[PDB]
Amino acid sequence: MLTMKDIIRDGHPTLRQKAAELELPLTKEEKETLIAMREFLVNSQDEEIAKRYGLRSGVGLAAPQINISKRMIAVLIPDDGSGKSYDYMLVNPKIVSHSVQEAYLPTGEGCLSVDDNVAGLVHRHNRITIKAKDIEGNDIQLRLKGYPAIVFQHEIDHLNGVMFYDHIDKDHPLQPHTDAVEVLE
Ligand SMILES: CC(C)(C)[C@H](NC(=O)Nc1cc(F)cc(F)c1)C(=O)N(CC(=O)NO)CC1CCCC1
Ligand SMILES: [Zn+2]
């Protein structure tokens, strides 16, 4: 069972490396890791389990965050009230196209690997198309917009050694870009 102790902290060199492509099929150990990454997210969203093991409520996790430099991610976003929810374990995900229009969370972002809040807007693409493999090596193509697009971009960034605060404007951290969509949390 993964917990907060498995999550490495900002400053750990693995978080700044470029994660390696997975060869398909995955090994059993790689499947188990990816399943446990999702299970961490499932556990973190269960009120009682999260309380018992001191878990922060997570919507995404990238393998580098548990010190595994491999291009795998898990995303678990519960129903936003519209019936849309996102439960994906992705292997070698890649943004193949995106909107020019940007989007941002109004209060900025945070990260399982970052202890202290960092104020400032993180502009990402409002719309993205991702190609990836699933855990069994089958093909997945996702068309994403708004909040889930932001989450997936955040996770893919981890695979390239990019941290959310890298995107914050030092002088004008709270100024939205022209025509950027404010995305409701
Ligand atoms: C850093 C943390 C606060 C744990 C964040 N969770 C989060 O925002 N959860 C959340 C918010 C809600 F409004 C309702 C709800 F059910 C859960 C998160 O998991 N991540 C994932 C991460 O660390 N990926 O590497 C950070 C998010 C900030 C923007 C996208 C991902
Ligand atoms: Zn993160």
mmCIF file of all heavy atoms in Angstrom, residues 133-173:
data_model
loop_
_atom_site.group_PDB
_atom_site.id
_atom_site.type_symbol
_atom_site.label_atom_id
_atom_site.label_comp_id
_atom_site.label_asym_id
_atom_site.label_seq_id
_atom_site.Cartn_x
_atom_site.Cartn_y
_atom_site.Cartn_z
ATOM 1 N N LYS A 133 -0.899 4.264 -24.254
ATOM 2 C CA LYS A 133 -1.322 2.876 -24.102
ATOM 3 C C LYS A 133 -1.959 2.701 -22.738
ATOM 4 O O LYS A 133 -1.634 3.435 -21.813
ATOM 5 C CB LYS A 133 -0.127 1.931 -24.190
ATOM 6 C CG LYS A 133 0.745 2.122 -25.410
ATOM 7 C CD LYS A 133 0.069 1.632 -26.658
ATOM 8 C CE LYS A 133 1.105 1.395 -27.750
ATOM 9 N NZ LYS A 133 0.546 1.897 -29.005
ATOM 10 N N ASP A 134 -2.856 1.733 -22.609
ATOM 11 C CA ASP A 134 -3.329 1.342 -21.291
ATOM 12 C C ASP A 134 -2.396 0.277 -20.676
ATOM 13 O O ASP A 134 -1.355 -0.082 -21.268
ATOM 14 C CB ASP A 134 -4.825 0.953 -21.275
ATOM 15 C CG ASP A 134 -5.141 -0.372 -21.989
ATOM 16 O OD1 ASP A 134 -4.257 -1.229 -22.214
ATOM 17 O OD2 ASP A 134 -6.330 -0.556 -22.327
ATOM 18 N N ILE A 135 -2.765 -0.211 -19.497
ATOM 19 C CA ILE A 135 -1.906 -1.119 -18.735
ATOM 20 C C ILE A 135 -1.647 -2.436 -19.484
ATOM 21 O O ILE A 135 -0.607 -3.081 -19.296
ATOM 22 C CB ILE A 135 -2.507 -1.391 -17.323
ATOM 23 C CG1 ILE A 135 -1.446 -2.007 -16.398
ATOM 24 C CG2 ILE A 135 -3.804 -2.220 -17.429
ATOM 25 C CD1 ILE A 135 -1.828 -1.961 -14.919
ATOM 26 N N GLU A 136 -2.586 -2.812 -20.344
ATOM 27 C CA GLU A 136 -2.452 -4.019 -21.135
ATOM 28 C C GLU A 136 -1.845 -3.766 -22.501
ATOM 29 O O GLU A 136 -1.779 -4.675 -23.330
ATOM 30 C CB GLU A 136 -3.791 -4.746 -21.259
ATOM 31 C CG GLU A 136 -4.196 -5.475 -19.953
ATOM 32 C CD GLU A 136 -3.183 -6.519 -19.522
ATOM 33 O OE1 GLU A 136 -2.670 -7.260 -20.386
ATOM 34 O OE2 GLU A 136 -2.905 -6.602 -18.310
ATOM 35 N N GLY A 137 -1.394 -2.539 -22.739
ATOM 36 C CA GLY A 137 -0.766 -2.209 -24.023
ATOM 37 C C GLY A 137 -1.732 -1.866 -25.147
ATOM 38 O O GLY A 137 -1.327 -1.738 -26.309
ATOM 39 N N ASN A 138 -3.013 -1.716 -24.814
ATOM 40 C CA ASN A 138 -4.001 -1.318 -25.813
ATOM 41 C C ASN A 138 -3.995 0.201 -26.005
ATOM 42 O O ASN A 138 -3.466 0.924 -25.162
ATOM 43 C CB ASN A 138 -5.373 -1.896 -25.460
ATOM 44 C CG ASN A 138 -5.375 -3.417 -25.536
ATOM 45 O OD1 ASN A 138 -4.933 -4.011 -26.540
ATOM 46 N ND2 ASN A 138 -5.825 -4.059 -24.469
ATOM 47 N N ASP A 139 -4.537 0.674 -27.124
ATOM 48 C CA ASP A 139 -4.434 2.083 -27.510
ATOM 49 C C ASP A 139 -5.561 2.910 -26.897
ATOM 50 O O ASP A 139 -6.724 2.505 -26.918
ATOM 51 C CB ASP A 139 -4.464 2.232 -29.035
ATOM 52 C CG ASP A 139 -3.383 1.406 -29.734
ATOM 53 O OD1 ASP A 139 -2.294 1.182 -29.149
ATOM 54 O OD2 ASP A 139 -3.641 0.961 -30.871
ATOM 55 N N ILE A 140 -5.211 4.062 -26.343
ATOM 56 C CA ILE A 140 -6.215 5.001 -25.847
ATOM 57 C C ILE A 140 -5.922 6.376 -26.434
ATOM 58 O O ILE A 140 -4.760 6.815 -26.475
ATOM 59 C CB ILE A 140 -6.312 4.993 -24.273
ATOM 60 C CG1 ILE A 140 -7.277 6.063 -23.734
ATOM 61 C CG2 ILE A 140 -4.940 5.110 -23.632
ATOM 62 C CD1 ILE A 140 -8.761 5.601 -23.639
ATOM 63 N N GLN A 141 -6.970 7.028 -26.936
ATOM 64 C CA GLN A 141 -6.885 8.414 -27.365
ATOM 65 C C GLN A 141 -7.948 9.215 -26.613
ATOM 66 O O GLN A 141 -9.146 8.917 -26.705
ATOM 67 C CB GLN A 141 -7.050 8.550 -28.883
ATOM 68 C CG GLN A 141 -6.665 9.946 -29.397
ATOM 69 C CD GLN A 141 -6.464 10.027 -30.918
ATOM 70 O OE1 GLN A 141 -6.689 11.067 -31.515
ATOM 71 N NE2 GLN A 141 -6.016 8.934 -31.534
ATOM 72 N N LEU A 142 -7.494 10.213 -25.857
ATOM 73 C CA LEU A 142 -8.379 11.030 -25.028
ATOM 74 C C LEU A 142 -8.492 12.435 -25.587
ATOM 75 O O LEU A 142 -7.479 13.050 -25.944
ATOM 76 C CB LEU A 142 -7.862 11.129 -23.582
ATOM 77 C CG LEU A 142 -7.643 9.853 -22.752
ATOM 78 C CD1 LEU A 142 -6.325 9.194 -23.155
ATOM 79 C CD2 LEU A 142 -7.601 10.221 -21.264
ATOM 80 N N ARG A 143 -9.727 12.928 -25.644
ATOM 81 C CA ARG A 143 -10.009 14.327 -25.927
ATOM 82 C C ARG A 143 -10.475 14.988 -24.628
ATOM 83 O O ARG A 143 -11.501 14.597 -24.058
ATOM 84 C CB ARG A 143 -11.065 14.447 -27.045
ATOM 85 C CG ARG A 143 -10.487 14.153 -28.455
ATOM 86 C CD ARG A 143 -11.577 13.926 -29.505
ATOM 87 N NE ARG A 143 -12.378 12.753 -29.158
ATOM 88 C CZ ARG A 143 -12.042 11.497 -29.433
ATOM 89 N NH1 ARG A 143 -10.916 11.215 -30.085
ATOM 90 N NH2 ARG A 143 -12.845 10.511 -29.058
ATOM 91 N N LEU A 144 -9.695 15.956 -24.150
ATOM 92 C CA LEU A 144 -9.898 16.529 -22.817
ATOM 93 C C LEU A 144 -10.020 18.030 -22.861
ATOM 94 O O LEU A 144 -9.399 18.681 -23.700
ATOM 95 C CB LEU A 144 -8.728 16.162 -21.899
ATOM 96 C CG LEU A 144 -8.453 14.661 -21.709
ATOM 97 C CD1 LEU A 144 -7.088 14.448 -21.118
ATOM 98 C CD2 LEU A 144 -9.515 14.026 -20.833
ATOM 99 N N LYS A 145 -10.782 18.578 -21.915
ATOM 100 C CA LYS A 145 -11.026 20.010 -21.874
ATOM 101 C C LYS A 145 -11.154 20.484 -20.426
ATOM 102 O O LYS A 145 -11.727 19.788 -19.591
ATOM 103 C CB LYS A 145 -12.313 20.313 -22.659
ATOM 104 C CG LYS A 145 -12.881 21.712 -22.485
ATOM 105 C CD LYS A 145 -14.331 21.749 -22.995
ATOM 106 C CE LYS A 145 -15.344 21.512 -21.865
ATOM 107 N NZ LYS A 145 -16.676 21.048 -22.373
ATOM 108 N N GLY A 146 -10.628 21.667 -20.140
ATOM 109 C CA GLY A 146 -10.839 22.288 -18.843
ATOM 110 C C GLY A 146 -10.113 21.543 -17.735
ATOM 111 O O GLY A 146 -8.933 21.206 -17.865
ATOM 112 N N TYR A 147 -10.827 21.277 -16.647
ATOM 113 C CA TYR A 147 -10.200 20.698 -15.455
ATOM 114 C C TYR A 147 -9.414 19.390 -15.724
ATOM 115 O O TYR A 147 -8.240 19.295 -15.353
ATOM 116 C CB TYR A 147 -11.199 20.544 -14.287
ATOM 117 C CG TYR A 147 -10.511 20.052 -13.027
ATOM 118 C CD1 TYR A 147 -9.722 20.912 -12.258
ATOM 119 C CD2 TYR A 147 -10.612 18.714 -12.636
ATOM 120 C CE1 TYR A 147 -9.059 20.455 -11.121
ATOM 121 C CE2 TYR A 147 -9.961 18.249 -11.503
ATOM 122 C CZ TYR A 147 -9.184 19.127 -10.758
ATOM 123 O OH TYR A 147 -8.538 18.670 -9.642
ATOM 124 N N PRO A 148 -10.042 18.378 -16.354
ATOM 125 C CA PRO A 148 -9.225 17.180 -16.592
ATOM 126 C C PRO A 148 -8.026 17.434 -17.522
ATOM 127 O O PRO A 148 -6.971 16.824 -17.328
ATOM 128 C CB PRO A 148 -10.211 16.199 -17.225
ATOM 129 C CG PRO A 148 -11.322 17.061 -17.754
ATOM 130 C CD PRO A 148 -11.448 18.159 -16.751
ATOM 131 N N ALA A 149 -8.160 18.351 -18.488
ATOM 132 C CA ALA A 149 -7.007 18.697 -19.346
ATOM 133 C C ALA A 149 -5.854 19.234 -18.503
ATOM 134 O O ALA A 149 -4.696 18.913 -18.744
ATOM 135 C CB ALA A 149 -7.402 19.707 -20.450
ATOM 136 N N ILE A 150 -6.194 20.054 -17.505
ATOM 137 C CA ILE A 150 -5.205 20.624 -16.590
ATOM 138 C C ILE A 150 -4.512 19.529 -15.766
ATOM 139 O O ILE A 150 -3.274 19.494 -15.672
ATOM 140 C CB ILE A 150 -5.837 21.723 -15.704
ATOM 141 C CG1 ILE A 150 -6.060 22.998 -16.547
ATOM 142 C CG2 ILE A 150 -4.953 22.049 -14.492
ATOM 143 C CD1 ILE A 150 -6.959 24.049 -15.864
ATOM 144 N N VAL A 151 -5.303 18.614 -15.211
ATOM 145 C CA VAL A 151 -4.738 17.532 -14.428
ATOM 146 C C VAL A 151 -3.766 16.686 -15.266
ATOM 147 O O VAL A 151 -2.646 16.405 -14.826
ATOM 148 C CB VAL A 151 -5.825 16.650 -13.761
ATOM 149 C CG1 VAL A 151 -5.169 15.491 -12.996
ATOM 150 C CG2 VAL A 151 -6.683 17.500 -12.795
ATOM 151 N N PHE A 152 -4.190 16.280 -16.459
ATOM 152 C CA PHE A 152 -3.335 15.441 -17.304
ATOM 153 C C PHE A 152 -2.055 16.181 -17.689
ATOM 154 O O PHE A 152 -0.971 15.593 -17.695
ATOM 155 C CB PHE A 152 -4.084 14.918 -18.544
ATOM 156 C CG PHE A 152 -4.913 13.676 -18.282
ATOM 157 C CD1 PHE A 152 -6.239 13.779 -17.847
ATOM 158 C CD2 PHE A 152 -4.374 12.403 -18.479
ATOM 159 C CE1 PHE A 152 -7.008 12.641 -17.604
ATOM 160 C CE2 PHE A 152 -5.132 11.254 -18.235
ATOM 161 C CZ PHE A 152 -6.458 11.368 -17.806
ATOM 162 N N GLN A 153 -2.169 17.474 -17.997
ATOM 163 C CA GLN A 153 -0.973 18.264 -18.313
ATOM 164 C C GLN A 153 0.006 18.319 -17.136
ATOM 165 O O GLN A 153 1.224 18.184 -17.323
ATOM 166 C CB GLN A 153 -1.330 19.665 -18.816
ATOM 167 C CG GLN A 153 -1.850 19.649 -20.258
ATOM 168 C CD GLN A 153 -2.440 20.977 -20.682
ATOM 169 O OE1 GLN A 153 -1.720 21.874 -21.106
ATOM 170 N NE2 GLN A 153 -3.757 21.106 -20.572
ATOM 171 N N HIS A 154 -0.543 18.497 -15.936
ATOM 172 C CA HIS A 154 0.243 18.510 -14.706
ATOM 173 C C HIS A 154 1.003 17.182 -14.570
ATOM 174 O O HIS A 154 2.201 17.185 -14.300
ATOM 175 C CB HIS A 154 -0.684 18.755 -13.504
ATOM 176 C CG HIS A 154 0.016 18.825 -12.173
ATOM 177 N ND1 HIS A 154 0.108 19.993 -11.446
ATOM 178 C CD2 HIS A 154 0.599 17.864 -11.413
ATOM 179 C CE1 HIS A 154 0.763 19.765 -10.322
ATOM 180 N NE2 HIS A 154 1.052 18.477 -10.265
ATOM 181 N N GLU A 155 0.316 16.056 -14.779
ATOM 182 C CA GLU A 155 0.957 14.748 -14.637
ATOM 183 C C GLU A 155 2.008 14.495 -15.714
ATOM 184 O O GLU A 155 3.097 13.999 -15.414
ATOM 185 C CB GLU A 155 -0.057 13.593 -14.621
ATOM 186 C CG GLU A 155 -1.040 13.578 -13.464
ATOM 187 C CD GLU A 155 -0.446 14.009 -12.123
ATOM 188 O OE1 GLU A 155 0.702 13.634 -11.772
ATOM 189 O OE2 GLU A 155 -1.169 14.718 -11.406
ATOM 190 N N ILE A 156 1.690 14.833 -16.967
ATOM 191 C CA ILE A 156 2.671 14.676 -18.058
ATOM 192 C C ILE A 156 3.932 15.533 -17.808
ATOM 193 O O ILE A 156 5.058 15.079 -18.048
ATOM 194 C CB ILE A 156 2.041 14.895 -19.463
ATOM 195 C CG1 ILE A 156 1.027 13.770 -19.745
ATOM 196 C CG2 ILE A 156 3.129 14.922 -20.560
ATOM 197 C CD1 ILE A 156 0.094 14.013 -20.927
ATOM 198 N N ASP A 157 3.746 16.750 -17.292
ATOM 199 C CA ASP A 157 4.875 17.598 -16.896
ATOM 200 C C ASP A 157 5.888 16.849 -16.001
ATOM 201 O O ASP A 157 7.106 16.956 -16.214
ATOM 202 C CB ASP A 157 4.387 18.895 -16.221
ATOM 203 C CG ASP A 157 4.105 20.022 -17.231
ATOM 204 O OD1 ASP A 157 4.273 19.809 -18.461
ATOM 205 O OD2 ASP A 157 3.737 21.133 -16.781
ATOM 206 N N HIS A 158 5.386 16.077 -15.037
ATOM 207 C CA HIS A 158 6.243 15.299 -14.152
ATOM 208 C C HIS A 158 7.144 14.338 -14.917
ATOM 209 O O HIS A 158 8.264 14.084 -14.489
ATOM 210 C CB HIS A 158 5.429 14.498 -13.143
ATOM 211 C CG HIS A 158 4.987 15.285 -11.957
ATOM 212 N ND1 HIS A 158 5.850 16.048 -11.195
ATOM 213 C CD2 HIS A 158 3.765 15.417 -11.390
ATOM 214 C CE1 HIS A 158 5.173 16.625 -10.219
ATOM 215 N NE2 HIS A 158 3.906 16.258 -10.316
ATOM 216 N N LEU A 159 6.648 13.812 -16.040
ATOM 217 C CA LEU A 159 7.415 12.879 -16.868
ATOM 218 C C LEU A 159 8.565 13.558 -17.611
ATOM 219 O O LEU A 159 9.490 12.878 -18.085
ATOM 220 C CB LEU A 159 6.504 12.149 -17.852
ATOM 221 C CG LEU A 159 5.283 11.424 -17.272
ATOM 222 C CD1 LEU A 159 4.544 10.702 -18.391
ATOM 223 C CD2 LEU A 159 5.659 10.443 -16.150
ATOM 224 N N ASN A 160 8.499 14.891 -17.701
ATOM 225 C CA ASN A 160 9.542 15.692 -18.356
ATOM 226 C C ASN A 160 10.373 16.533 -17.382
ATOM 227 O O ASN A 160 11.142 17.395 -17.814
ATOM 228 C CB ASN A 160 8.932 16.608 -19.439
ATOM 229 C CG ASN A 160 8.280 15.826 -20.565
ATOM 230 O OD1 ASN A 160 8.772 14.776 -20.966
ATOM 231 N ND2 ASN A 160 7.159 16.336 -21.080
ATOM 232 N N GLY A 161 10.211 16.289 -16.081
ATOM 233 C CA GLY A 161 10.997 16.989 -15.063
ATOM 234 C C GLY A 161 10.539 18.425 -14.875
ATOM 235 O O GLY A 161 11.329 19.306 -14.512
ATOM 236 N N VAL A 162 9.255 18.660 -15.125
ATOM 237 C CA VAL A 162 8.686 20.005 -15.052
ATOM 238 C C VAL A 162 7.729 20.074 -13.851
ATOM 239 O O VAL A 162 6.880 19.193 -13.670
ATOM 240 C CB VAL A 162 7.953 20.371 -16.369
ATOM 241 C CG1 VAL A 162 7.240 21.728 -16.251
ATOM 242 C CG2 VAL A 162 8.934 20.363 -17.552
ATOM 243 N N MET A 163 7.890 21.113 -13.036
ATOM 244 C CA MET A 163 7.073 21.296 -11.835
ATOM 245 C C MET A 163 6.116 22.448 -12.062
ATOM 246 O O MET A 163 6.447 23.394 -12.771
ATOM 247 C CB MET A 163 7.953 21.573 -10.606
ATOM 248 C CG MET A 163 8.916 20.442 -10.237
ATOM 249 S SD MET A 163 8.149 18.896 -9.688
ATOM 250 C CE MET A 163 7.645 19.362 -8.026
ATOM 251 N N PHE A 164 4.940 22.388 -11.442
ATOM 252 C CA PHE A 164 3.891 23.377 -11.715
ATOM 253 C C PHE A 164 4.360 24.827 -11.554
ATOM 254 O O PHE A 164 3.939 25.709 -12.313
ATOM 255 C CB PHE A 164 2.626 23.101 -10.876
ATOM 256 C CG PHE A 164 2.732 23.538 -9.428
ATOM 257 C CD1 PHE A 164 2.347 24.827 -9.046
ATOM 258 C CD2 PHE A 164 3.203 22.657 -8.448
ATOM 259 C CE1 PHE A 164 2.430 25.233 -7.710
ATOM 260 C CE2 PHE A 164 3.295 23.051 -7.123
ATOM 261 C CZ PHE A 164 2.909 24.340 -6.744
ATOM 262 N N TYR A 165 5.233 25.068 -10.574
ATOM 263 C CA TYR A 165 5.666 26.435 -10.262
ATOM 264 C C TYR A 165 6.624 27.004 -11.308
ATOM 265 O O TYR A 165 6.841 28.220 -11.345
ATOM 266 C CB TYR A 165 6.253 26.548 -8.830
ATOM 267 C CG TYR A 165 7.396 25.603 -8.523
ATOM 268 C CD1 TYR A 165 8.680 25.830 -9.027
ATOM 269 C CD2 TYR A 165 7.199 24.493 -7.717
ATOM 270 C CE1 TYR A 165 9.740 24.954 -8.748
ATOM 271 C CE2 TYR A 165 8.251 23.608 -7.434
ATOM 272 C CZ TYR A 165 9.516 23.855 -7.942
ATOM 273 O OH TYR A 165 10.551 22.978 -7.663
ATOM 274 N N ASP A 166 7.174 26.132 -12.159
ATOM 275 C CA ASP A 166 8.020 26.557 -13.291
ATOM 276 C C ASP A 166 7.240 27.491 -14.223
ATOM 277 O O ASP A 166 7.837 28.317 -14.910
ATOM 278 C CB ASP A 166 8.518 25.368 -14.135
ATOM 279 C CG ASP A 166 9.391 24.396 -13.365
ATOM 280 O OD1 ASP A 166 9.924 24.738 -12.296
ATOM 281 O OD2 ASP A 166 9.562 23.259 -13.840
ATOM 282 N N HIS A 167 5.913 27.339 -14.240
ATOM 283 C CA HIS A 167 5.026 28.097 -15.133
ATOM 284 C C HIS A 167 4.570 29.440 -14.558
ATOM 285 O O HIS A 167 3.961 30.244 -15.270
ATOM 286 C CB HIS A 167 3.780 27.279 -15.499
ATOM 287 C CG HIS A 167 4.071 25.989 -16.212
ATOM 288 N ND1 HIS A 167 4.621 25.943 -17.475
ATOM 289 C CD2 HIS A 167 3.858 24.702 -15.850
ATOM 290 C CE1 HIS A 167 4.752 24.683 -17.852
ATOM 291 N NE2 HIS A 167 4.290 23.909 -16.886
ATOM 292 N N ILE A 168 4.835 29.674 -13.274
ATOM 293 C CA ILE A 168 4.388 30.910 -12.624
ATOM 294 C C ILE A 168 5.260 32.110 -13.012
ATOM 295 O O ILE A 168 6.483 32.017 -13.047
ATOM 296 C CB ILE A 168 4.286 30.753 -11.082
ATOM 297 C CG1 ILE A 168 3.257 29.662 -10.746
ATOM 298 C CG2 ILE A 168 3.903 32.093 -10.424
ATOM 299 C CD1 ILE A 168 3.311 29.123 -9.294
ATOM 300 N N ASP A 169 4.596 33.213 -13.339
ATOM 301 C CA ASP A 169 5.242 34.472 -13.686
ATOM 302 C C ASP A 169 5.670 35.163 -12.385
ATOM 303 O O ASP A 169 4.837 35.472 -11.534
ATOM 304 C CB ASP A 169 4.259 35.345 -14.488
ATOM 305 C CG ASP A 169 4.904 36.606 -15.042
ATOM 306 O OD1 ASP A 169 5.183 37.546 -14.270
ATOM 307 O OD2 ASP A 169 5.142 36.652 -16.259
ATOM 308 N N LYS A 170 6.975 35.365 -12.232
ATOM 309 C CA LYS A 170 7.561 35.921 -11.004
ATOM 310 C C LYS A 170 7.063 37.339 -10.665
ATOM 311 O O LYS A 170 6.738 37.626 -9.506
ATOM 312 C CB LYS A 170 9.104 35.865 -11.068
ATOM 313 C CG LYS A 170 9.774 36.712 -12.191
ATOM 314 C CD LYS A 170 9.892 35.984 -13.551
ATOM 315 C CE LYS A 170 8.711 36.257 -14.500
ATOM 316 N NZ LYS A 170 8.455 37.712 -14.802
ATOM 317 N N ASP A 171 6.973 38.198 -11.679
ATOM 318 C CA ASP A 171 6.503 39.574 -11.512
ATOM 319 C C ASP A 171 4.996 39.700 -11.342
ATOM 320 O O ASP A 171 4.531 40.428 -10.460
ATOM 321 C CB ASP A 171 6.931 40.440 -12.704
ATOM 322 C CG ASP A 171 8.427 40.520 -12.860
ATOM 323 O OD1 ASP A 171 9.126 40.695 -11.843
ATOM 324 O OD2 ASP A 171 8.908 40.395 -14.005
ATOM 325 N N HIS A 172 4.237 39.018 -12.203
ATOM 326 C CA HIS A 172 2.775 39.122 -12.206
ATOM 327 C C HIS A 172 2.110 37.742 -12.037
ATOM 328 O O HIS A 172 1.346 37.313 -12.914
ATOM 329 C CB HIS A 172 2.284 39.815 -13.491
ATOM 330 C CG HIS A 172 2.899 41.162 -13.728
ATOM 331 N ND1 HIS A 172 2.514 42.291 -13.034
ATOM 332 C CD2 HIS A 172 3.878 41.559 -14.574
ATOM 333 C CE1 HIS A 172 3.228 43.324 -13.444
ATOM 334 N NE2 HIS A 172 4.065 42.906 -14.376
ATOM 335 N N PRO A 173 2.378 37.053 -10.900
ATOM 336 C CA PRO A 173 1.906 35.668 -10.706
ATOM 337 C C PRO A 173 0.396 35.500 -10.806
ATOM 338 O O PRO A 173 -0.070 34.431 -11.223
ATOM 339 C CB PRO A 173 2.381 35.323 -9.284
ATOM 340 C CG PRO A 173 2.529 36.656 -8.603
ATOM 341 C CD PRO A 173 3.041 37.566 -9.683
#
